[PDB]
Amino acid sequence: WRYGPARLWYDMLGVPEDDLLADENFLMVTQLHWEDDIIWDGEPWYSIFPIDNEDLVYGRWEDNIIWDAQAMPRLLEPPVLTLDPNDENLIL
């Protein structure tokens, strides 16, 4: 959407239509300083748990990383605002 959020960018552009890869290495026991957590001398009809972002949990957002600007493997498209209503703190 040309007139939506990011209209400023669209106007500036002037477009007007409208073995180290082994799974264990990445397990967070081998990548997290969990020692810091140890506490020493410290001093359901509706969901009980919260619902996670399905796009973060499931989608391949990694496909929106632009590795090479000139050699971009696919063609990206303008993104429309989707106003997810799962999030609270949004009136609608």
Partner 1 sequence: LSNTVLPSESMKVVAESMGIAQIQEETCQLLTDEVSYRIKEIAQDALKFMHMGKRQKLTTSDIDYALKLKNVEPLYGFHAQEFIPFRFASGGGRELYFYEEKEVDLSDIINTPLPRVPLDVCLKAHWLSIEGCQPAIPENPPPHELSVEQQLYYKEITEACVGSCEAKRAEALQSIATDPGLYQMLPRFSTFISEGVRVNVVQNNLALLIYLMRMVKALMDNPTLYLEKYVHELIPAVMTCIVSRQLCLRPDVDNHWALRDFAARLVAQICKHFSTTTNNIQSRITKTFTKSWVDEKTPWTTRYGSIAGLAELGHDVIKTLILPRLQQEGERIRSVLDGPVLSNIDRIGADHVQSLLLKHCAPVLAKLRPPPDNQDAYRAEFGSLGPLLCSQVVKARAQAALQ
Partner 2 sequence: RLKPRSIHELSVEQQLYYKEITEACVGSCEAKRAEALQSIATDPGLYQMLPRFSTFISEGVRVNVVQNNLALLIYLMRMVKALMDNPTLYLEKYVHELIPAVMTCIVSRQLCLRPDVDNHWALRDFAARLVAQ
Partner 3 sequence: PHTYIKTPTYREPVSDYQVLREKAASQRRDVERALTRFMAKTGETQSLFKDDVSTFPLIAARPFTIPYLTALLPSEL
| Contacting residues toward partner 2, per CB under 8 A | 24, 27-29, 32, 34-35, 37-42, 44-45, 47-49, 51, 54, 80-86, 92
3-class state of residue 31 by DSSP: coil
Query: Between 26 and 65, how does the x/- string for binding to partner 1 read (CB under 8 A)?
Result: xxx-xxxx------------------xx-xxx-x-xx-xx
Which of 18, 37, 41, 87 is the binder for partner 1 (CB under 8 A)?
Answer: 87
Smallest distance, Å, CB 61 to partner 2?
Answer: 15
What is the spatial distance between Cα 90 and Cα 80, in angstroms, rounded to a whole number? Answer: 18
CA 86 from chain centre, in angstroms, equals 15
Which amino acid would we find at residue 23? D
What tokens appear for 50 in the block?
């919260």
